[PDB]
Amino acid sequence: NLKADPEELFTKLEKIGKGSFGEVFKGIDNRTQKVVAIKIIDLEEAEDEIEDIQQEITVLSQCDSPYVTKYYGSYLKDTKLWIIMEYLGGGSALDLLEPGPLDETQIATILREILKGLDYLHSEKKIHRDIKAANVLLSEHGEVKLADFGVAGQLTDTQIKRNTFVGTPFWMAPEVIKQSAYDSKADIWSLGITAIELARGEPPHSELHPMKVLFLIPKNNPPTLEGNYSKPLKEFVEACLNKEPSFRPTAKELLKHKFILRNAKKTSYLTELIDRYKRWKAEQS
Ligand SMILES: Nc1nc(N)nc(-c2ccccc2O)n1
């Protein structure tokens, strides 16, 4: 139930996004005049990535949550496939880190919304598998959503675990790297790495070659959050970063963690961060 003739409904504007996926363009829904994001994939060109493109569309089409990038439709235009989704103009959580550090209220607020997204996905038996600040996108007013479902996994009655080596090495769970049978608990590990990223600006091992961390992560003790951070933040990270996945809490459980309860505030306060990035970006080299 793919669609056709996207230009009858959408106007394609300037380029805004990247990846090796394809490219992302700003666009307009001519029906509502809302701005959308249009990912253009050359099917004549990105052979074998095809199965992953198919998977991204499938997962996207099945999600209906304010914490997951809204899916408009996928469209065939000659050689190209148009994947049309929610436009979010507040940048990524990674962007927001560029001008300088966050405070724990900001970190907690962002984590809380990530957790709402994960709870939704995991309740749908979906696993994101590439949780990291770059894949956490904000609206211009501080709403926080998960993006980029290109390597998302689906559990079913006959497949209760996944095995595939996917993700971004610094953020990957040890059982994913070892390609053991894993599930949503993998996202919880990645979430812990993302919490360190939000607190420190970078994940553990970020200056090392990715191939290196592929052995370091299964072997070494789990990372901890070091530095002058509140005890609840440190324990939040610790909870997520358990080598044994069954000992990691669920997203649901983490929503009630003291770090989240004591420090998360209204998402609209994140506009302060969005403005800081816009200012920073405007005076940049
Ligand atoms: N992978 C991705 N998915 C959506 N739905 N939007 C975007 C995006 C990328 C750059 C700028 C704004 C955006 O909404 N990127």
> Is the separation of the CB atoms in 139 and 163 below 8 Å?
no
Of the residues 34, 87, 141, which should be mutated to test ligand 1's pocket, given the most ligand atoms within 8 Å of the CB? 87
DSSP state for residue 7 in the 8-state scheme = G
| Residue type (1 letter), 139 | S
- In angstroms, rounded to a whole number, what is the distance separating the alpha carbons of residues 49 and 79? 15
End-to-end CA distance of the chain: 46
Rounded CA-CA distance 38/199 in Å is 32
Distance 148 CA to ligand 1 centre (A): 8
Extract the tokens encoding 76.
Answer: 């065939």
Domain(s) of CATH 1.10.510.10: residues in the chain: 88-285
Q: CA distances (Å), 209 to each of 151, 152, 205, 213, 216, in order? A: 22, 24, 8, 7, 11
Q: Which residues contact 141 (CB under 8 A, 6 or more apart)?
A: 90, 267, 268, 271, 274
Is residue 84 a contact partner of residue 25, using CB atoms and an 8 Å limit? no
Question: By three-state DSSP, how is residue 92 classified?
Answer: strand
Long-range contacts of 148-152 (CB under 8 A, 24+ apart): 148/19, 149/55, 149/56, 149/59, 149/60, 149/63, 150/19, 150/21, 150/52, 150/53, 150/55, 150/56, 151/52, 151/55, 152/55, 152/56, 152/59, 152/121, 152/126, 152/127, 152/128
SS (H, E, C) 69-86: CCEEEEEEECCEEEEEEE
**Rg, the chain, Cα only:** 19
Strand partners, 39: 24, 83
- β-pair partners for 10: 29
CA of 56 to the centre of ligand 1 (A): 14
Token duo for residue 16 = 């805004």
Instruction: Enumerate residues lining ligand 1, CB below 6 A.
Output: 16-17, 24, 37, 69, 85-88, 137, 147-148
CA distance 62 to 26: 23
Beta bridge mates, 257: none
Phi, psi of 252, deg, nearest 5 = -50, -50
Q: Which residue ranges are tagged as binding site for ATP?
A: 39
DSSP character string of 19-86: TTT-EEEEEEETTT--EEEEEEEETTT-TTTHHHHHHHHHHHHH---TTB--EEEEEEETTEEEEEEE
Contact of 33 with 10, CB cutoff 8 Å: no
Using DSSP's 3-state secondary structure scheme, residue 123 falls into: helix
What's the topology of domain 1-87? Answer: Phosphorylase Kinase; domain 1 (3.30.200)
Strand partners, 136: 146
* In the chain, ranges of CATH 3.30.200.20 domains: 1-87
CA dist 261 and 254 (Å) reads: 10
CATH topology of domain 88-285: Transferase(Phosphotransferase); domain 1 (1.10.510)
> How close is the Cα of 196 to the center of ligand 1, in Å?
23
Report the catalytic residues: 130
CA distances from residue 24 to 37, 95, 162, 168, 193 in whole angstroms, order as listed? 6, 17, 29, 20, 27
Alpha-carbon distance 257 to 235, whole Å? 9
Q: For residues 246 and 253, give the distance between their C-alpha atoms in angstroms, rounded to a whole number.
A: 13
